């Protein structure tokens, strides 16, 4: 009801009907329309017609440019203050801090950023009232996972950014079919604003609306709400991806008995016609997308891609660990992608793809560092800063975290089961990061509990995916440090608890290091497609081959067990060398980190594996 006409927003709906929405969706839309005061409400239907109209609208406003060299591809350039996910402005709100992060022993927690409800209420009220004045509020109904999969979950994103709408169309299943599937069921409430109500108070850089000073990405798992303000970029604004599918989902997974993880999923088939599925957790900028889409160098081997970033997994009634990729496309780092580092990506991204912050060539193409591809005489480059750029300038032509956003269905090696609602059965889990020294090319964990410890102990040299810079070695347990939805100690206990399930077929757990360097600072391992030789070894180990030797850190390949035919140059001694001096320092750093950062919530089984590793190293 109403005594006037300040609550019914029907007269402002320019696509769809508030009457046709499920009751709780209408309330969520109308209540935030009352708060944010948009000029128009557009209820997305997911259609090709809508998508083409939206792209035309952004092209007219100067938000995106058409890349005339390719088929339906587009370029966006951002404000240089809004170029990446921002860990330092991302918070989780729970009544008790301990539900979000373990209470550290001495230091500040690195495992999450808690904010009280009372503080968030102040932050929210400082930001959202009136924030969409003069803009359109888009209503995005989307499904994470195949529509109707048992592991699928539905979200509603409200946003004032047409770029978010277009990107969500690629990255999720979006439109009217989701609403019909949702009915009166529950959904995750996602609210986003770039934070730039009209008339503009600050001028817009690169026609990219954002509010860097007030950027805040907040999660409220008890209310099933995600609330994000001030950034239009990637994981800050595409709320289905990191905010929903890792942070909110990892908490739901804890409650419901499954797992939501920063893992690629791939299927690999050997020359004897056998196929296995593996998942791999690497931190951002450590090569998940290269491995998920690998072109193997070994003949008779085939790799197919199920997903490159997020896995949802659950033991089924038979005890198999079944995984789905909840995304609908790939949001991959552009620079360094080339025919030699990721040829299956090159094939995927030449149609129906949105690029952000890469360089544009004068003939309507795309450029970036490491593309490894010469340009024709006369072809010039406009950098991501919208500036004439020569290979002689110090500037990169593309931002280091520039991205492509591409439909998964177009990948030439997309797995035939990538949308199966029952998921694929996972037989191995791989961990790894960037370790220039000390850590060998591959090893296999001694047991489930040791495997969980290996994940907990992950470390990786700092790169350029968040706001971290330099060549520091930081901890990133399970590749989830920016994405835990709840207390990491309880997360470890949850992983450990999977070994108590009836008829659970626990996968083997491996750790890889593509990044070991010799004294020259040169990579010991060629990597990329040659990593198929490491996968072959893992495949044999899952089948039970006697191809491992025991070391203090776990099992490594026996002499001659790795197929090195071709690269006869490889320094095997240094690639698999294990130094007592290095590993004594390594266990000490893990011990200090686990004691401070997990403290009273560290499971005894993890502390036991640390003691066991310390003892095996002392006996070297």
Ligand X SMILES: O=C(O)C(=O)CS(=O)(=O)O
Question: Judged by CB under 5 A, does residue 402 bind Mn ion?
Answer: no
Name the one residue in this structure whose structure tokens are 């300038």. 393
Q: How, if at all, do strands 216-220 and 90-93 pair?
A: parallel
Catalytic residue among 73, 210, 286, 405: 286
DSSP state of 414: B
Tell me if 504 sits within 8 A of 315, measured CB to CB.
yes
Tell me if 221 sits within 8 A of 60, measured CB to CB.
no
DSSP notation for 514-543: S--B-TTS-BSS--GGGGHHHHHHHHHHHH
Contacts with ligand GTP, 231-270, as mask; x by CB under 6 A: ----------------------------------------
For residue 429, the SS3 value is strand
Query: From the list ligand GTP, ligand X, Mn ion, none, which binds 514 (C-beta under 5 to 8 Å, kind-based)?
Result: ligand GTP
Pick from 549, 536, 173, 484: which is nearest to 324 by CA?
173
Query: From the list ligand GTP, ligand X, Mn ion, none, which binds 241 (C-beta under 5 to 8 Å, kind-based)?
Result: ligand X
Annotated binding site: 85, 233-235, 242, 262, 284-290, 309, 401-403, 434, 528-531
Catalytic site includes residue 411: no
Distance CA 564, CA 579 (A): 23
Among 384, 528, 539, 593, contact with ligand GTP (rule: CB under 6 A): 528
Among 143, 290, 382, 402, contact with ligand GTP (rule: CB under 6 A): 290
Binding-site residue total for ligand GTP (CB under 6 A)?
20
Q: How far is the CB of 288 from ligand GTP (least distance, A)?
A: 3
Query: From the list Mn ion, ligand GTP, ligand X, none, which binds 428 (C-beta under 5 to 8 Å, kind-based)?
Result: none
Query: From the list Mn ion, ligand X, ligand GTP, none, which binds 242 (C-beta under 5 to 8 Å, kind-based)?
Result: ligand X
Pick from 617, 542, 609, 546: which is nearest to 581 by CA?
617
Contacts with ligand GTP, 436-465, as mask; x by CB under 6 A: -----------------------------x
Phi, psi angles (nearest 5°) of residue 137? -90, 115
Query: From the list ligand X, ligand GTP, Mn ion, none, which binds 528 (C-beta under 5 to 8 Å, kind-based)?
Result: ligand GTP
DSSP state of 510: E
Please identify, using beta-carbon distances, which residue of 574 and 591 lies nearer to ligand GTP. 574
Q: How far is the CB of 17 from ligand X (least distance, A)?
A: 32
Question: Judged by CB under 6 A, does residue 510 bind ligand GTP?
Answer: no
Annotated binding site for Mn(2+): 242, 262, 309
Using the contact rule CB under 6 A, the part of the chain among 65-73, 179-187, 283-291, 373-381 near ligand GTP is 283-291
Question: Judged by CB under 6 A, does residue 288 bind ligand GTP?
Answer: yes
Question: Judged by CB under 6 A, does residue 514 bind ligand GTP?
Answer: yes
For residue 450, the SS3 value is helix
Question: 277: alpha, beta or left, given left = phi > 0 and alpha = psi -120 to 50?
Answer: beta
Q: How far is the CB of 500 from Mn ion (least distance, A)?
A: 6
Among 90, 94, 149, 284, contact with ligand GTP (rule: CB under 6 A): 284
Pick from 87, 107, 85, 111: which is nearest to 98 by CA?
111
Question: Judged by CB under 5 A, does residue 289 bind Mn ion?
Answer: yes
Q: How far is the CB of 108 from ligand X (least distance, A)?
A: 22
Question: Judged by CB under 5 A, does residue 309 bind Mn ion?
Answer: yes
Annotated binding site for substrate: 85, 233-235, 284, 401-403
Please identify, using beta-carbon distances, which residue of 488 and 528 lies nearer to ligand GTP. 528
Q: How, if at all, do strands 473-475 and 459-461 pair?
A: antiparallel
Question: Which residues, in sequence order, are CB contacts of 533 under 8 Å at separation 6+?
Answer: 297, 298, 562, 563, 564
Contacts with ligand GTP, 461-500, as mask; x by CB under 6 A: ----x-----------------------------------
Taking the alpha carbons at both ends of the chain, their separation in whole angstroms is 77
Q: How far is the CB of 238 from ligand X (least distance, A)?
A: 7
Query: From the list ligand X, ligand GTP, Mn ion, none, which binds 367 (C-beta under 5 to 8 Å, kind-based)?
Result: none
Please identify, using beta-carbon distances, which residue of 197 and 336 lies nearer to ligand GTP. 336
What residue ranges bind ligand X (CB under 6 A)?
85, 234-235, 241-242, 284, 309, 331, 465
Please identify, using beta-carbon distances, which residue of 238 and 465 lies nearer to ligand GTP. 465
For residue 468, the SS3 value is coil
Please identify, using beta-carbon distances, which residue of 191 and 430 lies nearer to ligand GTP. 430
Distance CA 430, CA 171 (A): 24
Question: Which residues, in sequence order, are CB contacts of 53 under 8 Å at separation 6+?
Answer: none
Query: From the list ligand X, ligand GTP, Mn ion, none, which binds 65 (C-beta under 5 to 8 Å, kind-based)?
Result: none
Q: How far is the CB of 59 from ligand X (least distance, A)?
A: 24
Diameter of the chain measured on Cα atoms: 83
Q: How far is the CB of 403 from Mn ion (least distance, A)?
A: 9
DSSP notation for 12-78: GEEES-STTS-HHHHHHHHHHHHHH--SEEEE----HHHHHHHHHHHHHHTSEEE-TTSBS-EEE--
Q: How far is the CB of 401 from Mn ion (least distance, A)?
A: 11
Query: From the list Mn ion, ligand X, ligand GTP, none, which binds 197 (C-beta under 5 to 8 Å, kind-based)?
Result: none
Pick from 10, 276, 326, 47: which is nearest to 165 by CA?
47
Question: Judged by CB under 5 A, does residue 327 bind Mn ion?
Answer: no
Question: How many alpha carbons lie under 13 Å from residue 107 in its C-beta half-sphere?
Answer: 10
Q: How far is the CB of 480 from ligand GTP (least distance, A)?
A: 11
Residue 322 Cα to chain centre, angstroms: 19
CA angle at 168 for the pair 333 and 253, rounded to the nearest 5°: 85
Tell me if 405 sits within 8 A of 167, measured CB to CB.
yes
Return residues touching ligand GTP (CB under 6 A).
Answer: 282, 284-290, 309, 332-333, 336, 341, 465, 514-515, 523, 527-528, 531
Residues with a catalytic annotation lie at 286
Residues of the shown chain interacting with Mn ion in the complex, contacts defined by CB under 5 A:
284, 288-289, 309, 332
């Amino acid at each position: 009801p109403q005594l006037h006409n300040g609550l019914d927003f029907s007269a402002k709906v320019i696509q769809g009907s508030l009457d046709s929405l499920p009751q709780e969706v209408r309330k969520f839309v109308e209540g935030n329309a009352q708060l944010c005061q948009p000029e128009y409400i557009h209820i997305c239907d997911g259609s090709e017609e809508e998508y083409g109209r939206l792209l035309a609208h952004m092209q007219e406003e100067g938000v995106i440019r058409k890349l005339k060299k390719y088929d339906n591809c587009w370029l966006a350039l951002t404000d240089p203050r809004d170029v990446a996910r921002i860990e330092s402005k991302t918070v989780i709100i729970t009544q008790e801090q301990r539900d979000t992060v373990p209470i550290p022993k001495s230091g500040q927690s690195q495992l999450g950023r808690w904010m009280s409800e009372e503080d968030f209420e102040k932050a929210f009220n400082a930001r959202f009232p009136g924030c969409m004045k003069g803009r359109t509020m888009y209503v995005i109904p989307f499904s994470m996972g195949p529509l109707g999969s048992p592991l699928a979950k539905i979200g509603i994103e409200l946003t004032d950014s047409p770029y978010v709408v277009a990107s969500m169309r690629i990255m999720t299943r979006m439109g009217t079919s989701v609403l019909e599937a949702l009915g009166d069921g529950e959904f995750i409430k996602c609210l986003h604003s770039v934070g730039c109500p009209l008339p503009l108070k600050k001028p817009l850089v690169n026609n990219w609306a954002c509010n860097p000073e007030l950027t805040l990405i907040a999660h409220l798992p008890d209310r099933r709400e995600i609330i994000s303000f001030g950034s239009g970029y990637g994981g800050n604004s595409l709320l289905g991806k990191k905010c929903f599918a890792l942070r909110i989902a990892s908490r739901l997974a804890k409650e419901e008995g499954w797992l939501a993880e920063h893992m690629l999923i791939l299927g690999i088939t050997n020359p004897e016609g056998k196929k296995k599925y593996l998942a791999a957790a690497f931190p951002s900028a450590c090569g998940k997308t290269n491995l998920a889409m690998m072109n193997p160098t070994l003949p008779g081997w085939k790799v197919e891609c199920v997903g490159d970033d997020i896995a949802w997994m659950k033991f089924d009634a038979q005890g198999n660990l079944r995984a789905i990729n909840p995304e609908n496309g790939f949001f991959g780092v552009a620079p360094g992608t080339s025919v030699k580092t990721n040829p299956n990506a090159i094939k995927t991204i030449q149609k129906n793809t949105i690029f952000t912050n890469v360089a544009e060539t004068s003939d309507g193409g795309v450029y970036w560092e490491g593309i490894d591809e010469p340009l024709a005489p006369g072809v010039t480059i406009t950098s991501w800063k919208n500036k004439e750029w020569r290979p002689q300038d110090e500037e990169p032509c593309a931002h280091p975290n520039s991205r492509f956003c591409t439909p998964a269905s177009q990948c030439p090696i997309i797995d035939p089961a990538w949308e199966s609602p029952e998921g694929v059965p996972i037989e191995g889990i791989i961990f790894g990061g960037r370790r220039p020294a000390g850590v060998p090319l591959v090893y296999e964990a001694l047991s489930w509990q040791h495997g969980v410890f290996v994940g907990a102990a992950m470390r990786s040299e700092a790169t350029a995916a968040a706001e971290h810079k330099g060549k520091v070695i930081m901890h990133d347990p399970f590749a989830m440090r920016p994405f835990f939805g709840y207390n990491f100690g309880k997360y470890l206990a949850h992983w450990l608890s999977m070994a108590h399930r009836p008829a659970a077929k626990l996968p083997k757990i491996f750790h890889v290091n593509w990044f070991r360097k010799d004294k020259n600072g040169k990579f010991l391992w060629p990597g990329f497609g040659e990593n198929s030789r490491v996968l072959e070894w893992m495949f044999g180990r899952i089948e039970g081959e006697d191809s491992a030797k025991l070391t203090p850190i776990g099992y490594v390949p026996k002499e001659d067990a790795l197929n090195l035919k071709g690269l006869g140059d490889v320094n095997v001694e240094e690639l698999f060398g294990i130094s007592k001096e290095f590993w004594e320092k390594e266990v000490e750093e893990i011990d200090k980190y686990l004691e401070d950062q997990v403290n009273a919530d560290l499971p005894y089984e993890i502390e036991r594996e640390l003691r066991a590793l310390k003892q095996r190293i002392s006996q070297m």
